[PDB]
Every structure is written in structure tokens, then in C-alpha cells.
Structure 1
């Protein structure tokens, strides 16, 4: 039922230390059944936010998670995706790059 779609973001790169605030505009989602996933080879972490951070079901403001390597020497590419935990549905991925701090 329904699909997940990332429409726009304020940024697609951030520090490998995590903690950057991201504004993500999306198609209708359910605040109690939604997450933001970051994935790379041998690594996965969720964006940090609460239900109050989901605005009118069409935008999520969250903080990026720390990357697996806190002392990056060059950019690394990971995928950012919306994920509905109930049915495991995933949105098409968006490129996100973690950078040296």
C-alpha cells in the first residue's frame, strides 16, 4: 500500500561524525511507521528523529548518524532512503556523501 518518495533535501553531504540536520520533503508518510536509512557496504544506520519531527506527514527533520569511520580522509558514498518498518518498503535511494570533519 502506497510508496515512499524523497522529493527534496536541504543537503546531500555531511560530516562523518554525524549530527547534521537534514530537512527531507517527501510524499505522504505515517509518523509512527517511518524511518530514514543510510546504507553502505557493511554499514547501516538510521537518521535520528522523533514523531514530532515529522511535519504534516510530508517532511522529516532529522540528524544524520555518525558514519562507521570518524576520521575519513576522503568522501565516501552511501545511500539515503525512506523506510517503512511495518512492511519493509523502501524509497528509491538518494546519494549522500560523508566527508572528513
Structure 2
């Protein structure tokens, strides 16, 4: 919200086993102070990427973490958004669906 805005992603669905490469275009973030959060009832994990994975401050390339359930028979919706660890500011969520692999 406010400052944190996801402009586009390459995909918004993905295996519950994690490891899907995600291209996230956004407004200015600071590689040193940024994270990509996945949230749902009883669960929360971050996408994996390095400061190096943040492109010109307006793009993040990371891998989705595995969902809390690897034995998913159907899709589970989860909120994916930018988190600034220092102040916990969150971007507006974007629906992500972990599906059965």
C-alpha cells in the first residue's frame, strides 16, 4: 500500500512444492529493505531472492516458497505482497494460487 505497489508478475499460480520463478515489477523498493510475503490462514512464507535479484529498484525475481501443504488436492488462494522488514509496510495483496503438483 502507499509506497509498496506490485505492478505485474509473470504468473499468479504455482505448485504447492514452491520453486516457481516469479518476475515482480513494482514501484521503487530498496533491495536492502524488501521482501516478498505469501500469507494465508495459519501460514506465511517469503519468496527467495537476493539483493542482487532486485533489478534497478523496480523489479524482483524470486522463487515461491513451498506451501504449508505439499499434498494439495485442490488450489489454495494466498496473498502475495511486498513487505518492508524495517516497518512491516505491506503492498496491496495479489492473489496467488498454490496448486497440486
Tell me the TM-score range normalised by the shorter chain: over 0.9
SS in structure 1 at match of 2:52: helix
The residue number in structure 1 matching 2:58 is 58
- Matches of 1:100 and 1:88, distance apart in 2: 30
**How many residue pairs were aligned?**
101
- Matches of 1:25 and 1:86, distance apart in 2: 21
- Matches of 2:81 and 2:53, distance apart in 1: 17
Q: What runs of 5+ residues in structure 1 fail to find an aligned partner? A: none
The residue number in structure 1 matching 2:48 is 48
SS in structure 2 at match of 1:45: strand
SS in structure 2 at match of 1:32: helix
- Matches of 1:86 and 1:2, distance apart in 2: 16
Deviations, residues 64-85 of structure 1 (Å, cap 9, x unaligned): 0000000100000000010001
TM-score by length of 2: 0.98
Q: What runs of 5+ residues in structure 2 fail to find an aligned partner? A: none
